[PDB]
């Protein structure tokens, strides 16, 4: 019929009304609307009327299916919500998300960080490292995350970061072998020089 | 100009002329053969 013609707004309105207002019926309506095709709204509704995670999961799946930058964002949000609510499965989901948005542009680093955090609640550190490696602002963020992880194996991480990329100088500072690090930094710097001088003095 | 390159040759059959070409004259009527 649609093809021939060639409603949505009306459907949306109806859904809204249902939400305002039976719950099962509303859910069904929402599902129908989705099929015909907001996701965020649906998720919110699920959270509210049902206290149900299944609905949330479904919403997430739908978002994934829809697939774009906005879609990706929605998915991320859903994941976050899930995490907040309440491990292996979660990890898997995170991995999937990562795979989907390898170089999305918007907040890959952030996503990685989130994943790491989830893991923590070594794996996290690894994830951070990966992000740092496979990922300018975003890259910087990833690097920072990696550094943090290292601080929290660390040396190895630092080395990796250095290899990937100032970074060298940072590594040297962290270390403070130290002399060698400083030298390396110099080869690939104002504070570095100072550090070197200090080392010499000691 | 008309100093020009080309696209294709030809081969069209007319009535024979009946002219006594020099080379066409008889010569080596005997064909050789192999042993078998």
């Amino acid at each position: 019929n649609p093809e021939i013609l060639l409603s949505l707004r009306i459907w949306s309105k109806y859904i809204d009304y249902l939400e305002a207002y039976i719950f099962n019926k509303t859910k069904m309506a929402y599902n129908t609307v989705i099929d015909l095709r907001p996701a965020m709204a649906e998720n919110f509704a699920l959270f509210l009327q049902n206290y149900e995670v299944m609905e949330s999961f479904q919403v997430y799946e739908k978002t994934i299916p829809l697939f774009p930058p906005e879609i990706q964002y929605e998915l991320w949000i859903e994941y976050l919500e899930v995490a907040t609510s309440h491990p292996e499965h979660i990890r898997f989901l995170f991995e999937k998300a990562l795979k989907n948005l390898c170089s999305n542009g918007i907040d890959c680093k952030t996503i990685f960080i989130a994943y790491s955090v989830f893991e923590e609640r070594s794996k996290s550190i690894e994830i951070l490292r990966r992000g740092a490696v496979i990922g300018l602002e975003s890259r910087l963020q990833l690097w920072r995350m990696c550094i943090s992880k290292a601080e929290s194996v660390t040396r190895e991480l630092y080395q990796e970061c250095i290899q990937i990329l100032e970074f060298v100088i940072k590594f040297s500072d962290f270390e403070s072998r130290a002399r060698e690090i400083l030298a390396y930094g110099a080869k690939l710097n104002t504070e570095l020089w100072d550090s070197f001088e200090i080392f010499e003095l000691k | 100009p008309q100093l020009e390159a080309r696209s294709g040759a030809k081969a069209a059959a007319y009535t024979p002329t009946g002219i006594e070409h020099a080379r066409l004259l008889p010569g080596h009527t005997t064909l050789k053969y192999r042993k078998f």
């Binding site: 093809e3 292996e88 499965h89 990890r91 070594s122 794996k123 | -």
Partner: protein, 248 residues
């Protein structure tokens, strides 16, 4: 020729021409055009036949999808299902590798599952996925997706297993993860853990120690085994481990 026919509006002749064209194993494009023409004409009896013919001529999974799409557009749900079955059957029938890529079959399967989900009965989808698994990675993924859409526990387990496998392929952290998965059939898990332990410089040593500890814990949960482990450790050679053993 077709456009001329259309202009004229004498249609039988055009149809005949189309048929003739399609008998000469022509391009997919031609087939598509024919289909379009059929659609434009009032009748949807014969279109199905033509689609079938096209499919026969072009074993390509996109063709199948197209056919299905037409079915969807058409009112009948049963018809679509039948078509799907036929597609599946055809794929099954050629066991020998005379086939479109294993990605395409997987895609088809996924589509079928989706269709089933949209329909009333879910068991069917599950059955289909089981069948797929029986006859790979793509298929597994599809199955997982289906499960998610929908059993949940089973799906989760499958996912975990997959993860473990991946970890193994990659291969201390991985080993740990695998162990965790195993912990999360019991006998199998135990075996896996043992294997991991067997597989398992300072970092490496630490990992080994951790593994040993885990093994000990498992044993406790479940003496001879512990003793054996201790012996193995000794052979390899720690003090802490020895102390623990003594305590045990």
């Amino acid at each position: 020729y077709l456009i001329v026919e259309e202009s004229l509006n004498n249609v039988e002749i055009v149809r005949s021409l189309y048929t003739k064209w399609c008998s000469l194993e022509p391009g997919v494009n031609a087939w598509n055009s024919f289909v379009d023409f059929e659609i434009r004409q009032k009748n949807w009896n014969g279109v199905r036949e033509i689609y079938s013919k096209y499919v026969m001529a072009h074993p390509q999974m996109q063709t199948w999808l197209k056919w299905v799409r037409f079915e969807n557009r058409h009112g009948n749900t049963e018809f679509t299902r039948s078509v799907y079955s036929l597609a599946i059957d055809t794929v099954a029938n050629l066991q020998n590798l005379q086939i479109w890529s294993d990605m395409e079959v997987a895609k088809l399967v996924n589509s079928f599952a989706h269709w089933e989900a949209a329909q009333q009965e879910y068991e069917r989808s599950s059955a289909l996925y089981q069948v797929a698994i029986e006859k790979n990675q793509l298929l597994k993924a599809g199955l997982l997706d289906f499960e998610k859409q929908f059993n949940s526990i089973e799906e989760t387990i499958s996912y975990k297993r997959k993860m473990d496998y991946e970890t193994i392929l990659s291969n201390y952290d991985t080993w740990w993860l695998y162990l965790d998965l195993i912990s999360e059939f019991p006998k199998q898990i135990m075996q896996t853990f043992e294997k991991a332990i067997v597989d398992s410089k300072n970092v490496q040593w630490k990992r080994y120690i951790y593994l040993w500890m885990r093994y000990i814990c498992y044993v406790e949960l479940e003496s001879l085994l512990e003793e054996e482990l201790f012996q193995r450790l000794i052979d390899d050679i720690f003090s802490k481990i020895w102390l623990m053993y003594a305590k045990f």
